[PDB]
Design a protein around this nucleic acid. Structure first.
Ligand SMILES: Nc1ncnc2c1ncn2[C@@H]1O[C@H](COP(=O)(O)OP(=O)(O)O)[C@@H](O)[C@H]1O
Ligand SMILES: Nc1ncnc2c1ncn2[C@@H]1O[C@H](COP(=O)(O)OP(=O)(O)O)[C@@H](O)[C@H]1O
Ligand SMILES: [Mg+2]
Ligand SMILES: [Mg+2]
Ligand SMILES: [Mn+2]
Ligand SMILES: [Mn+2]
Lengths: 374, 381, 374, 368
DNA sequence: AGTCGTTGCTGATTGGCGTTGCCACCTCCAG
DNA sequence: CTGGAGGTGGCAACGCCAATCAGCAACGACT
């Protein structure tokens, strides 16, 4: 799962059609590239276009469909986003587009047209929305709720995994590791117990006792119980990653039913405390390490080699930001390619290649470099 | 002279949505009868007269009925504020009670007064001291710690007691009158008030403890306790009201008077079989009113809808159940013995066995539970 | 409300006893003051002490009590925070402290010791948790739930008001405007409809009709319907404040049951848009203006004379940040004292009054300037 | 023989943010002083002693202090429960009140009492009749109860030459109401006819806060509240009636002016007019701050105009309590208007609107 | 006519509200 | 020092319900 090309047409402040190819003269080194520009220029819009093309959805907007489409640019009758990604050495293409009735800047939002195809032979693999989503999920291994946790870190949602509730962390882990059977076991146990109870026997008593142990609707309880090993492996990988990203802290799981992680402050004689006490920058670094561990966890089943960090580099001071960027450079020296969006002046010099985005004298629109114009 | 020592009435208290109106009325009537029988000169109520700052209407009705029916006996009455009732609520009726052979103190600084006997002659020096709220006796200042503020409070309350007892001695002078003292605070014979800081008064009638006891082995300093059981932790204990006698200006003796129990209560332990066995003792008894029970079911992982079982067991009985609980607290999580084990390697049966091993159940149900668990895997395949 | 002095002891990274007294020589002008220092130095801890001493809570930790206290520094036996504030020309002092058993770090946590007393009179007003909280809420007008939204803007939670549920937004509006009679009406309508329905198990259908119109438990429906006028009154002040902060946008109420604020883009021919589509910096500025308006909604009853916000300026470029700082300086003319947490070098150079939270390497502790030691 | 007639004290009433403790105290001490001066035989309070059913702490202290100070004077006293007063709040202390030459009646059906003079000789028949709850007993039911109760008193008096007095807390035809007057019998009775009162020698009534002679006869009166309980009656002086009896018949009725201690004023007009009307208190130095109701005639936002109103007042020895516009804010509109605005968006069929309006009104009243 | 483009009609999720229970916090006490 | 009983409130899991998206078949406009 590496983004090869990105094509978008009239999304947010980016009027017109543009394409960015990550195999041209820039990005040839696969190094750090920094989307830079003023506020409200379409920097976040590029990552939103990528996410929309992949999964028909945006971090800000819950759904874009026949109704409530508000990602399309004003006084514009059509918008589309297309990406090319490579999985297991072969490349695919994803397409999502929507146009207005009679091609007017007003009128009904027509049902969007989507497709998924191979670049090897051009064969169309899926055109329905549901079938495309299912097929791309099976192919990539990442749903939206895993793409937005491992590959794309939105601004303000970097600590979403750290601050998520146990239910939606265990559900993420079971799907990521392909160990979903335990949820079905709890669902079946709860259904059997409820069916036995509604008839009203010692068998009902045994069913109740079994339900109190592992049984629960939607499979929450036994899933949370079982994913302890997965959380321990993940925190091991995250600690190994974090040793070089921030040397002060370590990570370990706590002795609680809720899937939670505690830090071990090696400076203060290994005093262990909860992550709720971490500073903003420390929590950002911990969440980045956890995301990298999420990527490394499934490297033996499906390999993801791209990472996008929307924001949160400001929470760091200069004396820590340089170390974080050095660790990111060390990671980027491997197969992983990473792109960072920030306004801080220090990162202006360290990252030499930039996808600059510029607004136009208050007209309300914005354009990036003409070399990306179609 | 003779006085009674009582405290912790807690009028208007609601006890698991129940009301203590009848019990309090019966206790007050019994106290009036006892005072008339024993020819008492004064009655002292050491704080916690009301269970809240704004007692309900019937609590005020009970207090008014007691203070108006006490006029027949002619004996004096002293009511002090506790940590529970409100200073303003008690000061509401100060002047109106002043005409009804009754004195109520809620605030600090109230000077010592002379208790008259039934014939009007000076009997004793009261030296009334209510629950000393910190906002009344100290002034806060910046730059202190949590323990330093407590030390200042203790020093201030000790100084207040000493100065007020000195004023009481000055008032007494030469007449042989026993200087009674009063308070509503915790003593241990730290944040408690040491007993050795009390002045050398002839008697100190304290409050804030619901259990009758002697402090530091000094019989002239006593806790009278509540006259009725206010919780299940004291249901089986008998409650006392002290009858104190003085002679020739010195303390003579203290006598304990049992307050008859009006509303019986009991507490039960053990499993459901033990609960049934203990409920057997009420199979055929005419109980007026029905006895209130607290049931603590010892956990053996029965995990049943025990409220329905208790309701069915106690339906035919003359029994009302106020509370039932159990000790089911336990953690449920996997311990990773080594990092080499991952959720893909371990089988479903292995994980379920790891789950069961954390529970202390036996083979009497382990085999059946494992069979039931395997039935689920059977029906998904 | 305004803060006169802050005294804390052994909170987070700030081992020792520190007293920061405003109205001194450096702070006499009521001008801009910024708290500067490396990440993890304890800057947020200064703002955590102010919230702790007042409302027994801190933004990161839901509650601190006997059962848990993660705020006091490791290898230390006690912690305390005490603030002096002034309401309507009269000064008050709030105090919160906790000590470990036997003065040993391994001992169990004892109950906190809280007080609230006038500064000049010296009389104690409250000594218990609930009494102190209720009395300070009545005195200041605003409890914790309104402090954290109109007077202190914590890190990462500036957009809490916009992103909150409509229920929470309406509840906050009632708290500020003291209009709970509508919620009480709706709740009792729902209760009486339920009672009539159970008594059934022609009045029932009429009760159900009234319940469908305005009836709901805890009064959701009628609260939301009634608070629209308050939302419009707030939007007026929000537009007034936002005109100076960011001249592009204006705010307009959504025409839907779930009370929400749409935005008008004056540059795009006054095209109206949902508020979800705003950029990060634009959303931060909108939230700041809306919070300033929210503190100006009750100016006649209980005026608020200070504002604290935490590293929200990291999402602004060098020009939008300059406009926002000019607006904040202009608002400082009114006498509202602003305290800012940041790492941006431009604004750190701009603001001359600073509280430098110096960090001690290796130990993990930190200290202020020598003049603030006690 | 003399009797002071007062009612509608409304003790413990919170007037907006403010409280009426000082006004009530300066009224009660003056009332005791005038009672001693006129050597009155009894003082009667017919209803609304307390503003609500759960009076605050200070209101009860004021009531108890007044009753205690009554003993030094020697006058008998009567208390009646009004529409806002509640049983088990006045009736709970009844037994204690008996020992202090005071009788308290809250429940109906109380037998008539003989009111003694200062020398101990009988002076009159009281006929204690409080605010009659409909559940405790409709227009005829009030009338026959009054006739039956008067007949019982007539039997008790026999041929003795004593006046007969009657009490009541009810609205009557020809009366003028106010905003603070809470209505009673919302769904059963509209007004009591003044001609149905039994031929008692004098009638003492409350409920109405304005002193009024009702029905055209002298022996029926409204005494009204002793202090202004609303902004619509600030300028009208308050009265307490000192009735006199002799040879079993009414002699004369006199009005006593209660000295006002808390100035209250109402402003009107545009902001330009108010900027001039506020100059009535420029550098006057009123030691009790004046309470003002400002009826601004502007369309400007209330939360914006209150700022300049406060700015103008800051240079004056005045304190504004209420500002009302004569766009809208939620603090202005009535609950009925706000609910109707919900009904308007729904179908406007009157057949259901009338029932829904009645249901909403009864719900709101059950809240109050 | 054809072809495409736009519009109107069922089923499967999904978020929202209410119900019941469980657990945690505060306060006044007792071992 | 610690526990512990007794309100009081908050959160969470489950049940039922109404709104919405996706799929499908039937007319209007442009060549
Ligand atoms: N439907 C729309 N039409 C036009 N502009 C829009 C629309 N939705 C959002 N925008 C604007 O597009 C811009 C996107 O900026 P964004 O990429 O979020 O900035 P940043 O990278 O600084 O966070 C903002 O100015 C936003 O208000
Ligand atoms: N209980 C504790 N003992 C010691 N240090 C702590 C404790 N809790 C938090 N800390 C540390 O105190 C520091 C507080 O920094 P903070 O004020 O959050 O920084 P910033 O202003 O950059 O957000 C962090 O290093 C945090 O990990
Ligand atoms: Mg952004
Ligand atoms: Mg921070
Ligand atoms: Mn009335
Ligand atoms: Mn009245």
């Amino acid at each position: 799962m590496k983004i090869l090309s990105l094509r978008l047409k009239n999304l947010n402040s980016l009027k017109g059609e543009w394409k960015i190819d990550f195999t041209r003269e820039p990005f040839a080194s696969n190094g750090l590239f920094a989307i830079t520009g003023p506020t409200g220029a379409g920097k976040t819009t590029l990552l939103d276009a990528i996410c929309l093309a992949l999964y028909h959805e945006t971090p800000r907007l819950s759904n874009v469909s026949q109704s409530q489409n508000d990602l399309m640019t004003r006084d514009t009758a059509e918008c589309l986003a297309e990406v090319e990604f490579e999985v297991k050495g072969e490349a695919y293409r994803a397409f999502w587009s929507q146009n207005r009735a009679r091609n007017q800047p007003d009128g009904n939002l027509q049902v969007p047209r989507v497709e998924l195809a191979r670049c090897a032979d051009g064969k169309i693999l899926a055109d329905k929305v549901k079938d495309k989503l299912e097929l791309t999920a099976t192919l990539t291994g990442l749903d939206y709720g895993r793409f937005t946790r491992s590959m794309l870190l939105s601004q303000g949602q970097f600590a979403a995994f750290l601050n998520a509730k146990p239910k939606e962390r265990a559900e993420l882990l079971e799907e990521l590791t392909g160990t979903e059977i335990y949820g079905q076991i709890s669902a079946m146990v709860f259904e059997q117990h409820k069916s036995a109870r509604t008839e009203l026997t010692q068998q009902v008593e045994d069913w109740g006792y079994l339900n109190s142990l592992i049984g629960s609707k939607e499979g929450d309880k036994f899933r949370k119980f079982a994913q302890g090993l997965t959380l321990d492996n993940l925190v091991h990988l995250a600690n190994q990653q974090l040793t070089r990203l921030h040397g002060r802290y370590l990570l370990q799981r706590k002795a609680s039913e809720a899937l939670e992680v505690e830090v071990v402050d090696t400076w203060q004689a290994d005093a262990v405390r909860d992550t709720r006490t971490l500073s903003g920058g420390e929590s950002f670094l911990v969440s980045l390490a956890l995301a990298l561990a999420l990527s490394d966890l499934v490297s033996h089943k499906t390999r993801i080699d791209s990472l996008f960090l929307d924001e949160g580099f400001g929470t760091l001071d200069s004396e820590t930001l340089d170390t974080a960027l050095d660790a990111l450079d060390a990671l980027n020296a491997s197969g992983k390619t990473i792109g960072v969006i920030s306004h801080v002046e220090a990162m202006k010099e360290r990252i030499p290649v930039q996808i600059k985005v510029k607004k136009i004298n208050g007209l309300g629109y914005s354009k990036l470099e003409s070399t990306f114009a179609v | 002279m003779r006085i009674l020592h009582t405290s912790d009435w807690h009028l208007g208290q609601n006890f698991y949505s129940k009301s203590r109106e009848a019990e309090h009325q019966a206790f007050l009537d019994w106290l009036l009868e006892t005072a008339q029988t024993h020819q008492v000169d004064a009655i002292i109520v050491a704080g916690d007269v009301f269970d809240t700052g704004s007692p309900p209407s019937y609590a005020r009705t009970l207090y008014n009925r007691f203070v108006v029916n006490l006029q027949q006996t002619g004996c004096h009455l002293v009511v002090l504020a506790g940590n529970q009732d409100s200073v303003a609520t008690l000061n509401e009726s100060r002047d109106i009670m002043a005409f009804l052979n009754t004195t109520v103190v809620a605030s600090a600084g109230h000077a010592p007064q002379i208790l008259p006997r039934r014939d009007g002659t000076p009997g004793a020096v009261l030296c009334p001291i209510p629950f000393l709220r910190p906002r009344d006796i100290i002034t806060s200042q910046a730059g202190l710690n949590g323990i330093e503020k407590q030390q200042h409070l203790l020093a201030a309350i000790t100084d207040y007691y000493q100065q007020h007892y000195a004023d009481a001695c000055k008032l007494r002078g030469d007449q042989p009158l026993p200087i009674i003292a009063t308070g509503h605070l915790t003593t241990v014979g730290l944040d408690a008030f040491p007993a050795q800081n009390f002045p050398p008064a002839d008697y100190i009638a304290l409050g804030h403890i619901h259990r009758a006891q002697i402090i530091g082995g000094m019989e002239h300093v006593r806790y009278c306790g509540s006259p009725i059981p206010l919780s299940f932790d004291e249901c089986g204990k008998s409650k006392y009201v002290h009858l104190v006698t003085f002679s020739n200006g010195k303390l003579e003796s203290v006598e304990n008077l049992n307050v008859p129990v009006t509303q019986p209560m009991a507490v039960l332990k053990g499993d459901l079989a033990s609960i049934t066995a203990q409920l057997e003792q009420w199979r055929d008894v005419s109980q007026e009113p029905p006895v209130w029970l607290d049931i603590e079911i010892t956990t053996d992982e029965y995990l049943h809808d025990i409220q329905r079982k208790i309701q069915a067991l106690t339906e035919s009985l003359p029994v009302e159940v106020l509370l039932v609980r159990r000790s089911r607290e336990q953690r449920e999580r996997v311990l990773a013995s080594q990092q080499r084990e991952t959720l893909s390697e371990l089988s479903v049966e292995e994980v379920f066995n790891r789950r069961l091993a954390l529970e202390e159940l036996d083979e009497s149900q382990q085999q059946r539970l494992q069979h039931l668990f395997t039935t689920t895997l059977h029906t998904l395949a």
